[PDB]
Design a protein around this ligand. Structure first.
Ligand code: NA
Lengths: 206, 203
């Protein structure tokens, strides 16, 4: 079963992440920056980023146990030693990291939750911006990609209301020559479609 | 000269009314300006839509502003003036707070980095808008140019303005009273996206 697979690969899929709060450098065995992805899905993005940037430590967060099993297999097939995976939600980030332990949050094709009464479930809503702040501290950035126009418009306004600085914005990423862009599985199936991929980098003011 | 004979619409001495544009309109209706009015379809249409708002359009080229004058005349609207001035002259014409909103429609993109300083969303110009609006105003910005819109969102953010509205496809976003420019109406048959932002000052 999926639960046996994750128990057997517990060196990648860390079962006790709260035990490493403030000590994640001892987990990776170096003092390199830790970047996280909230919503790893099947794990092509974080595996690709781990192989591209071996001097960056990566931690994928993925609530959905069914899909994280796949992420563990792609991390294993990658042979990258700089990536762990946590089967937790965004609310638990503050149980796992101290302020400043994370340098960057990746969000890729987050659930848009388009209905007004579901605003608080969007991963760009103010509550999650605060969770990201509590793990990144003074500096820190969010690198955000979505195909959903409603979510990206909402996110630009949410980022702005929170007081973040927009340093990068593309309203058509695949025609914008972002060198070293690592696609998610979902993103790969868009260049043929022709619909724009939206991208933002936003940072805390210092 | 066409302008001399329509000098109650085209004001040749706008610097003389600084701090007293309410004496020109004859009321304390909020003053909204357009920087780069072109042939005037937009400011004519806005004036007809919002008779409770005083509109002042600025156009650098006299050859273009005479067409704007005619369109204002044809609309029969009494709440529109047109100034043949540059955007740097705005602080000679308006007291801080006398203007309540700045409209920017399909402004020149100036993509070359040496000409960033000519883009009307560059910090120099956001400061000029601040000097005529104080902190109680907004900028309403439409463009089809993706590069200029991307630059402008970033320029707004660096300046510290609050983004309260953004559409990445205006003609599929159902803005109820949208008044188009000549360019907006003709060249939106392509299905090229129209970008729109509303930004304001943080109090
Ligand atoms: Na180690």
């Amino acid at each position: 079963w999926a639960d046996d697979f994750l128990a057997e690969n517990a060196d990648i899929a860390i079962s006790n992440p709260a035990d490493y709060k403030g000590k994640w450098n001892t987990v990776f065995g170096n003092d390199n920056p830790i970047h996280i992805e909230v919503g790893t899905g099947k794990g092509q993005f974080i595996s690709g980023m781990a192989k591209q940037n071996p001097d960056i430590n990566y931690i994928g967060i993925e609530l959905f146990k069914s899909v994280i099993v796949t992420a563990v297999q792609k991390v294993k097939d990658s042979e990258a030693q700089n990536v762990k995976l946590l089967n937790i939600d965004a609310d638990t980030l503050t149980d796992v990291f101290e302020p400043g332990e994370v340098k960057r949050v990746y969000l890729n094709f987050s659930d848009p939750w388009p209905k007004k009464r579901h605003e608080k479930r969007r991963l760009t809503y103010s509550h999650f911006l605060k969770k990201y702040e509590e793990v990144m501290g003074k500096g820190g950035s969010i690198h955000f990609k979505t195909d959903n126009r409603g979510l990206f418009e909402y996110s630009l306004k949410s980022f702005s209301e929170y007081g973040l600085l927009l340093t990068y914005v593309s309203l058509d990423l695949h025609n914008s020559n972002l060198e070293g862009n690592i696609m998610t599985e979902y993103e790969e199936k868009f260049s043929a479609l022709g619909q724009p991929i939206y991208r933002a980098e936003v940072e805390w003011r210092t």
